[PDB]
Amino acid sequence: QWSGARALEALLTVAGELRGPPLQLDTGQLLKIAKRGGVTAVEAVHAWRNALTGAPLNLTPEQVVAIASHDGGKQALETVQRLLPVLCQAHGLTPQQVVAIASHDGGKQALETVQRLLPVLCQAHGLTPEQVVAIASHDGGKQALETVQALLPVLCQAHGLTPEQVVAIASNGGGKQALETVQRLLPVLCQAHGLTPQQVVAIASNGGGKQALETVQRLLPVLCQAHGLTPQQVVAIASNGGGKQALETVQRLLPVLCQAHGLTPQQVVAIASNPGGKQALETVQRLLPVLCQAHGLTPQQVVAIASNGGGKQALETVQRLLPVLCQAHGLTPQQVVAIASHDGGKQALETVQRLLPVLCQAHGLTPEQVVAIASNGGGKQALETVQRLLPVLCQAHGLTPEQVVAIASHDGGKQALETVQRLLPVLCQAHGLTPQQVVAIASNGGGRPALESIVAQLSRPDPALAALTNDHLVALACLGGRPALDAVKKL
DNA sequence: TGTCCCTTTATCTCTCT
DNA sequence: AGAGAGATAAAGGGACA
């Protein structure tokens, strides 16, 4: 037969019951768990399906999938049941944080290491818990914690890094590697290459920081003399998540892209200054003549689509979907370029293709309103959320559809919508704010934390905001959001 | 294979003026 | 509101017991 059938039979033999309460896992969730956690994760979920659902831990089903769908997810599950009370009580963390720590490869290690090392990190080095958690909240968190413990002193003192900087570095997959490599290369890159520490920190503060830093060290000279790049541009390529891959590729392709296709070096850096920038540069080299021919896309537009995270996915998706979107859905290509010119262009485009008729027919929106919603990072997330929430928002609350679209039409519009639904009653009913004001606060990027900040203050007043009326607090919220709301807490 | 660590990519949310 | 930055997810490899 096949070495895996006995395993898969066990997968489904259990899977059937997970569709029952308390979890009611759907095909999707179950796939996710089977795929990433393995057979032992799926059995673990089932075995402990009650223990971690209500009394005492009270996890949502989404939270249980979150923890179980990683390598060793079973171990993370047995560890969460053990340490979550301890961490929540003996260290003052919340449920959210613990789960966030648990939801990664080697989640048990990370949890156990937070338990063993949070006190010493928070005192002897004065890190805040929030910082101890951020460092923990990545694959291999255990290592980054131990490596932050070991190297925080030498990195602040012998190298001049602030604790904020040390944390930014560690709070990425392969965090230990990033730290150890900063130890070694930081003088070299500052003295030998004239980099400022803020830049070295910037490069190291992504996954594959180790590879990025090393590769900057190796190719910064080449790129600067022999290619006409400034150090500014080079750090940008390195610090943006494309890293090693993006740097190696730019060296390869910058000449070609400038020569054959008439791109400025500047246009080329913008394509690489994003996670997977290499995928983005190559795809451009393949598809720039294609999309500019049978379409009428200008290179500016093509560069624009390419100049975001997952530009390749964006460009490839534009190629497939442009006709059908223009022809069947009556979109101009300019609208099509607009939807694709953000991170996750692919998703926004696929989601518009699917949801544009339902948003218009069922909910009485204009295509313009659908493009506008879609023309932002996580547009897919905003579109699906408008669909779900636009009736309940403009039906009980009393919001206009124009208003809802204003909230949805910014990065994190899903967050801002879900948040407006939660907090509009209390803000209006309990603290006297008008709906138009709530919309105004949520009709900006960072809508969600803005709202939470202005509910924090009103509900549990800091006297340090005393001399400000509601309207004043609101004016701050619409201009600066959470940041402007707090800073004022420090005045 | 089970678990842990790491790198790359893609996506999503928030900040900063 | 556009550039920059941070957080979260997804996929897959090395490594080891």
Author numbering: 231 to 721
What text does the study give?
Transcription activator-like (TAL) effectors specifically bind to double stranded (ds) DNA through a central domain of tandem repeats. Each TAL effector (TALE) repeat comprises 33–35 amino acids and recognizes one specific DNA base through a highly variable residue at a fixed position in the repeat. The crystal structures of TAL effector (TALE) proteins bound to their respective target DNAs have revealed that the residue at position 13 is the only one directly involved in DNA base recognition, whereas the 12th residue stabilizes the proper loop conformation. dHax3, an engineered TALE protein, proved to be a useful scaffold for structural characterizations. We then present fifteen crystal structures of engineered dHax3 variants in complex with target DNA molecules, which elucidate the structural basis for the recognition of bases adenine (A) and guanine (G) by reported or uncharacterized TALE codes.
The structural observation suggests that Ile34 may not be a major contributor to the affinity of DNA binding by TALE repeats, consistent with the classification of NI as a “weak” TALE code. It also insinuates that base A may “tolerate” a wide range of amino acids at position 34 of a TALE repeat when there is no steric clash. To test this speculation, we generated dHax3 variants with the 34th residue on repeat 7 substituted with different amino acids. In total, we obtained nine high-quality structures that elucidate the accommodation of base A by Leu, Met, Cys, Pro, Trp, His, Thr, Asn, and Glu at the 34th position. Among these, the hydrophobic residues Leu, Met, Cys, and Pro all adopt conformations that do not clash with base A. As what happens to Ile34, there is no specific coordination found between these hydrophobic residues and base A. Trp, Thr, and His, in spite of the presence of polar groups, do not form H-bond with base A. They also appear to adopt conformations that simply avoid steric clash. These residues may all represent weak code, if they are used for base recognition.
